[PDB]
Symmetry: D6
């Protein structure tokens, strides 16, 4: 009952809301921003840039559930970095699995990428568990990689390959 | 069917065109630029409004219901050839419209645009469509191997064509 | 028939212009650029607003119904010539307005634009049009072979002219 | 009871109306135009160009009476060409004298021009009489100067100088 | 009078400014470009919005009635000087406002802009204004001969000035 | 006081920003360009929307009244420093919001922007402001002589700083 | 021994020389020009415009013999207007036939045009004879079509079709 | 004297043009923009390279000495008129070239540009110039009062014309 | 042959490329824009310098003699396919270079660009070339009917392809 | 002296103009923009090449030695006034040239430009120059108080003028 | 080895940069745009001259031979990290310069750029490179699976890091 | 015997050389740069920007001795920050006093600034002594203000006022 669709300009307020409660700077095409005004101008400036692709997941009643973002897309190595955010009022209702599958499905069956990877805070073992359930595997434990809430934190880098995803039931 | 009209695409038709996409498990293109959002489609529309490499038409019935899209792409004016595609919206498939749509497109291509050759691709795994095109005078000239990545695998397609001299005679 | 007035084309008349084309089996042109959509037409209009190689006028009745279009194209200010065409909306064909529009267009061309020669094309397989133009003082100067691809085949056209000296001495 | 004020964009429809019933091409900064659309674009394009200055004369109830135009303004020789047009519904109500004085007043007491000249058709002796009454004097009888209604016409060039205007009662 | 406020000119004030002109028999200027129409004024406004050679303020009363205009032009930031003019709208002349307006302008010039010298021109044929400026501490430093063409003849003007050290002490 | 929230400045807050200036006897600046009018401000805003040398935030209460402004300027990403200022609207002065805004601004600067040093200027002839900042952990590092021309005379200002290491170990 | 090649910028002096001794205005993409400077700027401005194509014919020793120009190229009706000029020192050496065949060959076997037409002065029966020998046929006798050396002259319009050219020996 | 040739002005002739001005006590103009320096002239040249309201030609002898300049300005393609001026370099005055240049300029104007009327200005206090023009078929149509400020005073000028019909029937 | 090197096209190579054209009786294209002159080619080169739809390489020997041109066009990075062409200059045809050139192109396409499929067109009336491509692992997937207007008639071409998995295994 | 010629400034003269500056203890301006370097001067020159608010001329002798600069600034074409300055290069001061230079400038201003009034500023602390201008028909119309910051203090200047009717009669 | 100097990259070093790539079986990038030709590289250089996300330096010897390249990319000024790579020209490999270049690059990164973390990628199937970096204080934090398509297959890479705190306390 | 002159583009190599041996990032109008190419582009971009002014001091033989830079120039508060650098081969030859006086002279007698201030490393007592001798006084001891050679360093801010400089001998 959830559907994935391309981000549109009318979704920017939702996006901006989602970044509001985060203890790290937000980027659009690697340019940092804080305001809705910046975001809108960056959106317009990068509208044809294929290095990042974003999608929103909506329910049957068109409530926005979450954001799926693919950034650092490289079309020789056929890799991209993935992040998802679910709106606070929809957390813990088991939608994160659905969003991850929809993003993997799109990445691997339409965009024809070879590898998707993500970062997750070491101090977030619940999210680690989710990504592992969905076929991600740790390939890195990056040390003091991001300054987050007043201190350099460690993150896990985790990946999945297209060949795994598409053939693992065959 | 005699009631179906073909007209040029206009900017107020892009919502329809964009909806025709979200059902397809292949990337969509406008003048060979990929796009996913309506916003992207609109900017691409504006950017290529004078470009004669591609031409698009929509078909409406009598009540101005949008029936489908006719698209000519890769238009070359020395060799006088174009690649043709048609999409019919969901709620109007299975109504015996396809033939009329194909006929209006061929008519325009050959009676107004003065093209020599029109070709199309159809999935090998789509035999009913092959049959249909065959009835409208298309003939296979190629079986393209692993040509397009569609829904998670590289798929073969038939390339079918028809010529102006055949259609007009 | 003296209730018909000729005015310069304006951007709000482009819908009417575009409608007049849908009834013709020949590619339409604006300043020699082909177009099919209203959107195209409107941008071409904007692009050529100051270009004096073509001039257009619409004819209206006392009640402001749009009757037809007069176009002067390939205007050359050394040789003082131009190609002329009229198009009457379907719903007003056969009402006896064509002779009036022709006279208005000639009057403008010869008394205000100070042109020396006006010519037109007419289909050879359109003899009653040939007859109308003769009655209005045009004379055949060419029979152009396979000149235009129209409705699936190359068609022959008569070129017909009239001069300023003849018109102004009627 | 008549007042002279600078032309504004909202007056362009009036201007365009005034040119409608004229048997000569109209110019804005020496560019010919027929449509309202052209006029508006030319207006915007030349908004800072000091080679021409235009003014509208309005009554007490803000009805537009006429147009005063100064063109070919040259600030070394301090000369300009003047034309006035009165709207057909206000002709023959003795406003032409008032418009001419207002334009001369502005030309000579604010713009500090040295010479104003105008052209008038030889075949318009009524207008010749008006300008003579207002202190203009013939300096030229220009032969076949303009093509007007199907034939080259003669015009009088007539002038007045600032020193005449400002000191003739002293 | 203590109720009169000075604020920066804004785009919605240009109608007022333009009206203040049509009564004057001299050409009006914006950043030394002459203008006659409102349309010209608006484009000039937009074109020079960042230019610090000239600064303008309007004075309003308590009910936001527009009282007049204060204009500093020829602003030079090495020599720290500017030429000052004030115009009071018709329906508010003869109300004992001029002094307050001049005082607000001098205050701004000397307490915020940190100018050293402010000068103005007044027509010789306008003695009552000379007297007024004199009361506000201005002194004649020149009698400019045939300086401006105004209403059909070249007219003389007085140039009057006041310094920051005098005003602030 | 925990009902106050800090958000990024947006174009719809510029009226409030502009209002805050009319109460100050010092020239105002936006990215080091001086401005006096709202029109100026709005163009400067647009011009500098992507410039990361200055960042601004507005504080609102639970009922969305605009309480004040936090500005970080001269931001340098090598030396990791910035100059900080707050301004509280007149109608909310003295209500005990200043300490809260300061803490929010410091928290942002030190936990999200990862700055090393924040400094400010305060008037020497403003001792109770000096006292507020001391209470919030700032220490004097300069007494700048005749630094700014304010209200008719050059005034002295204290420069006061705080470091990231001190703040994060409170 | 003659070869046809695309016009290049270094050939412009030759082109300009060729127009020098002609009693009609010269055009580049329907813009008139007299100077070498104009020509060069027009060349650069229209470098990607497919409405006209020009070629120079050179001998074995790279002497420029003549110019072949195709203008008014239309890619729906697949027609173009052709002109050739031979440099005065190479006239009457039987090169005109060769240039005409090379242009027809290119038009019909590479550009895939359907129709080529040209104008020739009625008062130039020698050139009429040449074009007739090379398969052109009169389709029009255009009356007072061009002002040439102080008077309106008549011209023959003459054409050849691709199907004639390609199949006439079959 | 038939060794003199008329060619279009080119950018390498601007030094000569500029030199011709230093000998005149009147402001010089290029497309109605006044100029004093060579630098100005060169930019004005570039700016107006495609503008057809003025055309210029230089006359050279068989040995390529620059003899003089022919200028056609205020060219109007409806009324088919232009203002003509010649200037002969000081060192070639009195040699009998002026009549030849005049004839060349008239021939061009009337046989290639297809103009209807050419006019010129000559100083009233320059009677031998008046005499030259009369001999070349010009006739006075105006005596313009205080038309141009020249060398410290406003001077009167004769306007003198010739028509195409008269010239071509000589 | 082991001495032949493939490098990226550069602007000083456009003279060579242009010369390779004047012998061919088909229109030449750069990013699907037709061109005839060197001047046009140079402006097209500059205009598309960042466009990744087409990639070109020249092959030189040891003495930096230009041997030929390798061109990948219609490059699509979702389907991972490109159309390939090679031209060998006159004075170097018939020297047993073609195979090496084709091998360097396939190598680059499949080992660096990570394309999945490479296809080419060859004239049906050119059997010796078909044979050659066949030896390098290409296989016919289409016989395109009256596809291109070449030297005065519409000609048929074979479409041949090879896949990355085949080449690399 | 009869040998001295006035011509319009050209771009190759900017080196001379820039050298005339480095001796003066006041900021230099071009169209009221301050400048210090040659590079700045050259860009300002190019930017204002069409601006008729200021006009400049250089005077050369017979051997094309540059003698000095004549500058008209603040040119107003309604009031027909301009501010005039002249600088004579070091190695040519004290040669009885100044008068001729002033005469050529006045001649141009009044016989060609058709200005009504020319004015200049001279330092009060420069009496010999005042005398000179007086001999050329200039008269004091103002004593401007603390007008310019020059070499570390605000200095007074005389404003002197001459009219067209006087010069030409 | 202390005769080696590190300087900023300049446009005259791009030939050397380009030469270093021809020896690598991986697509090259400039500010994440892939390039193959020198022409491309030179335009990308120009385009990104002010972009601070990447910085490059070339190492030369006392005789000015170009030894190698140090590149810092993905530079982030909040988290204070960057990815580092060196490349030594073929002819200078094995000479013992790599350790020196590494130390120079680290010194710059940590003492002038004030970065917190430097990381690099090295091929897993390049163990002696792994050994060099370990000796220079780098430690493995990831083994990235099938990260880059190199020479016909997806290869694994080690990610290796070093911190500012460790380096500056050596 | 030393002279101060405005910086010119031909001096940029000298400037770049001077920054070479410095353990802090270099800025031009607050934009950081390392390469000569960046510097040149920044120079051109800011050529009319009055926020910074630079001067070079040359001897009698035109050897460049040093750079004087005024940055953060503010024309309301009439203050600027000053730095000087002397080329290594000219250090310790007593030129620093001369450069400081020339800069103060220019600042105070031509630019009409009110205040000049500078920063000097606390760990550079020799330079502190020099500036004190030349009338500068400490107004601040800024704590951990700049990251310089691997650690946050303290600097003295020191100032002098125009009124002191100009009147202290009176
Ligand atoms: Na994108
Ligand atoms: Na199109
Ligand atoms: Na037009
Ligand atoms: Na105007
Ligand atoms: Na301003
Ligand atoms: Na910012
Ligand atoms: Na072309
Ligand atoms: Na022209
Ligand atoms: Na490319
Ligand atoms: Na000027
Ligand atoms: Na960079
Ligand atoms: Na500067």
């Amino acid at each position: 009952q959830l559907t994935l669709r391309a981000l549109e300009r009318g979704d920017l307020r939702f996006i901006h809301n989602l970044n509001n409660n985060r203890n790290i700077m937000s980027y659009w095409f690697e340019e940092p921003y804080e305001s809705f005004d910046e975001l809108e101008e960056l959106y317009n400036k990068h509208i044809h840039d294929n290095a990042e692709r974003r999608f929103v997941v909506e329910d049957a009643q068109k409530n926005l559930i979450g954001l799926v973002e693919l950034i650092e897309i490289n079309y020789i190595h056929r890799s991209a970095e993935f992040q998802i955010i679910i709106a606070p009022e929809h957390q813990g209702k088991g939608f994160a699995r659905t969003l991850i599958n929809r993003a993997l499905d799109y990445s691997f069956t339409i965009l024809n990428l070879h590898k998707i990877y993500l970062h997750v805070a070491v101090e977030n073992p619940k999210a680690v568990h989710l990504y592992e359930e969905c076929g991600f595997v740790e390939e890195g434990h990056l040390v003091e990689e991001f300054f987050i809430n007043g201190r350099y934190q460690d993150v896990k880098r985790m990946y999945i390959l297209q060949s795994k995803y598409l053939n693992r039931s065959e």
